[PDB]
Amino acid sequence: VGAGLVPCSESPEFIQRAASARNTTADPNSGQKRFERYAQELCGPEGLPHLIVDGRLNHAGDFLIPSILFLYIAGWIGWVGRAYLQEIKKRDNTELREVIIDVPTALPLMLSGFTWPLAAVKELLSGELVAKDDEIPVSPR
Amino acid sequence: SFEKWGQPGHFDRTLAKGPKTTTWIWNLHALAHDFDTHTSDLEDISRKIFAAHFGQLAVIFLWLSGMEFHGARFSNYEAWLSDPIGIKPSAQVVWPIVGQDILNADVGGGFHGIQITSGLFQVWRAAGFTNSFQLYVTAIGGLVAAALMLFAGWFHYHKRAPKLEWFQNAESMLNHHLAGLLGLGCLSWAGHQIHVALPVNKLLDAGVAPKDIPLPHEFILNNSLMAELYPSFAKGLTPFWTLNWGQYADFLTFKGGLNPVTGGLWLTDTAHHHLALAVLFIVAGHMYRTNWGIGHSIKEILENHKGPFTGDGHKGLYENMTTSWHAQLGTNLAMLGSLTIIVAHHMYAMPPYPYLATDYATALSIFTHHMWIGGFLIVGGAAHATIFMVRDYDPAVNQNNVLDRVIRHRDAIISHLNWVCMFLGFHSFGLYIHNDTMQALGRPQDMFSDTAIQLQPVFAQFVQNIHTLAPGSTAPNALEPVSYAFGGGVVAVGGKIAMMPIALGTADFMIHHIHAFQIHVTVLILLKGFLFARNSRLIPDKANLGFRFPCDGPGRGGTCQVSGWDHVFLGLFWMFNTIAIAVYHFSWKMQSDVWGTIDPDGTIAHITGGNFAMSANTINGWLRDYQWAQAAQVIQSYGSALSAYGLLFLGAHFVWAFSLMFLFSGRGYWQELIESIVWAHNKLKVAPTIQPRALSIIQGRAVGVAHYLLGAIVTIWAFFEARIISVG
Amino acid sequence: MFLISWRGYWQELIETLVWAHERTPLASLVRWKDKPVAMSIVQGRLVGLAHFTVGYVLTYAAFVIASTAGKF
Amino acid sequence: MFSASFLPSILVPLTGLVFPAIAMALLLIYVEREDPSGI
Amino acid sequence: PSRRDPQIGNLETPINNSSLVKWFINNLPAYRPGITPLRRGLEVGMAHGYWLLGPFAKLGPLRDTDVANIAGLLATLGMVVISTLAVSLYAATDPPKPVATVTVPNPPDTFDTTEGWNTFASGFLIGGVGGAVVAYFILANIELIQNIFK
Amino acid sequence: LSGQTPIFGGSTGGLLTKAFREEKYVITWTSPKEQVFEMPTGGAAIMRQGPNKLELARKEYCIALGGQQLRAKFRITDYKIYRVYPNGEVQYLHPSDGVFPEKVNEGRQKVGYVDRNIGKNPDPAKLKFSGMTTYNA
Amino acid sequence: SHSVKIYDTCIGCTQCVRACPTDVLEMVPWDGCKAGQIAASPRTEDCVGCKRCETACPTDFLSIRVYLSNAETTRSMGLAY
């Protein structure tokens, strides 16, 4: 947290901005409150805070858990999409329904993405995620 | 009765089966309307056109009534009523959430929102609008009429549809429309004017208690107040029964000029105008032959006009004008376009509404809007002319006619045309850059303005002059000149100019000449595609093959871009240039020596200071002395309450470069990249069944030109919008 | 200009423009060293690219040296 | 000027104009030569 | 009614086959018979060198200086020289398809040959110089009309 | 051959100096009916009875008329085409198969051949410092 | 002019011979498949480079190809002037 960066608590220009900090929304405490919420980080001569990313508990949670949340949701959406696609093909109405979504079937697949990570891990160990270099017949060259 | 929509491709037999690849999507949005490409029958076509017209009218009514309603509940009209100067109209109040809260366009009286520029209140300063409830009723009427005529379209298509001979009575068409539509509507509007408009206009001279001013019902049968003014308007004295019209000199007069108490002209002139037009084209539209065995046999008129150079004249032209549709489409589009641009080129010297020349924001917005639409659609008129040429013609009914007589000697025409274009082009631009070099070369005596080598457009000066002293002799029963840019006195109000005479010195010459230059080359491209549409000196199968196709292989070297709509591509690029520099010229002059402020001596202190006589002669000056002013605030024009609208000019450049990306590149490259990504996806078992395929080269060209135009026009409107906000 | 327009349009008008010399008098004396035709495709691409690159080179150099010698 | 002579006054035009002239003239008459000799 | 066939790429418009114009074009020194190529060169030089000195005489960068007459003279001198150079080298490389495109009802003349072109260029040079000096003499005494003052 | 032409006033897309000094193409056929029709050099005309002499500068226009115009519309299939030298000769390019069949004969022209699979095609490595291309086997 | 290239995959539908407007093809007698007459190029000298022919070839990896040469002339370039 070095590099010549003053704490946002005691950076004079920080509170100087905080004084007439333009309260954005329809509540008078909007601006001031957020500046109060910006005492944990450490400002600089620009008067605005920089973010440190190291796992260092000074700013660890301020970047780690959002990353993990994104991984959660991206895994969910990718998993349910792939599962839906795999399911459609066992109907022999393939491209008919490619544009007409079968809602009574599209729902439970979406609702059943609860345990995507570890299940995916299983498909990794079972090897249920990849087809074989030559079995996949998509010809290169 | 809802079992029918979700059966796509209902109109085409080919794409109705199924979406093999993504291509099936694209054509879905491409052939949804050209139902001439569906059968050979015509009654169906006509019925579809009727219903589509009704739908367009319905959306018209909807949007106008909704805009009213916004004007009634969220617009500072009735406060801006009492003061049209110290208040700037607005609408579309900002919604108070994160992101749009600082954008409160406060225009006095605490009314926040969005400071609009479309001058509807100006109409609402002539229509005499007091309370918003009547306006509420107006919107209700508009929307119910919309729904009504939409239902009418449904009925006239699904229950009782018209027959086929109902089409080609152009005679009754012209008669009914010309007379009944135009004359009756115009005379009805004039009657509304005289009854209500000028009365409340009178009543808007000194603060005469607007809402307290009576309602029209207090004047339907109450002639007392109607007898206050205009003694002849007791009832009317009805001297028309006695054929005497001298009594009516009260309201139905002829002034012809600026009325410095209204910000516009004298409305009585407009009323008598509308009267005269009404009866004039009523008796006009009573011309052609119809069901009473009396009139012109119009297909014989064109038979008569022939002669030595004519060949056989205008023989055989109606099969074209009625059997085919694209013909009519193209010609009417061209005419409308021209008409619209003259309208634009017209209503900045004769403002027909109250508070127009005194309101320096709505003027150029309206002007440029209409001007852009004009060209933007006349090119389409020419395109439909070409599509007629490829779709509809006849070798039999077109023997030696004035039509065929050009398609036989096209080469001479177009060669001489190219000659003219080259001549004018460098004769103007190379002259310009010559003077550029001279100024950069310490040889200033070789410049071309008044202070140097001479040239003066005497013709415009003399025509303006002979226009200056028109009244008295040419116009005895006329009081003032038609305008004040030709001649007369500098008419104004406050410290704010309304109209002064315009000066044409040296810089006018090359500007008008390059205008003509670009128009010439535009005609060149378009007419070239027109004539060389069916057969070229190398491609004798064009019409035998179509008019929308990319190329004909690398024969004869290259042949890519040999269709016609690529000709109109190049043409639309060129017309973009034309209209862009045209609006540049107009804005700069009418902000340089026409508009500014005024002192008690009538001293017009213009905005810029007459910069054409100083810099509008060399290129480097043209960038300096125009866009320095046109942007020096947009950089900082953001950052407060009535500034926060960070404009998407910074944003439009991106779409422009993204545009030009599509132009310079082929497609096989993208196809191969697509195939590689497909390989990867197939390796991870996510291969999309519908196999993606890259765009077709014509599709890519179209999206490129579309994005190009969009970015450019967005950029420029952002420019002068913020520029007027800096002064208005 | 060189990049956008392609060689399916710059040949039709060369036809009619050859048509001129054949039929005007007092100048039909001279004739052709060699029969002129439109450019080629690859050559068109090449010349367009050359123009683009030369246009890009000059302005930036002028800007940089002028700025450096005018601001220090 | 300096210690050299007039030379920089007039030695550009011939290199600027006439040498290009003969260059292109000779070149053009070269690109039309007969067979099988050529200079 | 075309010249020989109505399907040929030519037209009988009354500007390229009017009796006035054909008489006016036939008797020009480029076509009028009964003369030598020498005289042709002489006359063309006379005409052109007689008019091709004004266009820069009072128009050159020395427009209003007290010398510009002889300046324009030297200019048009060099001009006619380089023009003769051009036509001479054209003759030097002349004989692919040793003809001229014919549209006048008759062939123009035997003027269509290399050495003919060379002699023509010589006569052009002479006549051009001559027209130059004679125009310079007409223009020399600005008072050419002031002595007449008519 | 024939000495008569369809009804056509005139135009500007006729012949040039290349035509009467390098080559002319000629096409004839039998149209015992006179019907208006189109031509590739701009404009229209109307055929004549029996023999019909149409003379032109290029070849593709005759092909287009014979294929797309004559037998595709008016069912005339005996149009012959010839090439005319500058010095005045008369050549014979066609009928090169008599009946315009494009597939019939008892024996044909036996000029070269290549029946070779493309997967086994030579590379710029094996054919070097020669003047030929992948055409060899 | 340019060079033409023939193969064995000619099924014999003969859509190319009806597509080339330049008279550079003919079906010479063959024996191998049901075709019995395979397309070939006897009159290359009038090749144009339009290559509308293989676009009319339905065979997988269309049976005809055209190697676009470099010895062009007034005929191969196709000028009316």
Ligand SMILES: CC1=C(/C=C/C(C)=C/C=C/C(C)=C/C=C/C=C(C)/C=C/C=C(C)/C=C/C2=C(C)CCCC2(C)C)C(C)(C)CCC1
């Ligand atoms: C331009 C424009 C516009 C506007 C438009 C307009 C403004 C229109 C007008 C229109 C009109 C203005 C119309 C009106 C009409 C009317 C009429 C057509 C009338 C008729 C009448 C009649 C028919 C009568 C009847 C009767 C009666 C009533 C009584 C008894 C007797 C009788 C029967 C005679 C808009 C914005 C949209 C868009 C953009 C552009």
Ligand SMILES: CC1=C(C/C=C(/C)CCC[C@H](C)CCC[C@H](C)CCCC(C)C)C(=O)c2ccccc2C1=O
């Ligand atoms: C990008 C590009 C392609 C790529 C081809 C395609 C089809 C790219 C299109 C990608 C999709 C269709 C764009 C979708 C745009 C949407 C904003 C994406 C939203 C999708 C999610 C929201 C679901 C070409 O094929 C091509 C061909 C010829 C000249 C230029 C080009 C060219 O520039």
Ligand code: SF4
């Ligand atoms: S190349 Fe095509 S058209 Fe020709 S014979 Fe073979 S399959 Fe038929």
Ligand code: SF4
């Ligand atoms: S380009 Fe194709 S169709 Fe034309 S001649 Fe050559 S091979 Fe035949």
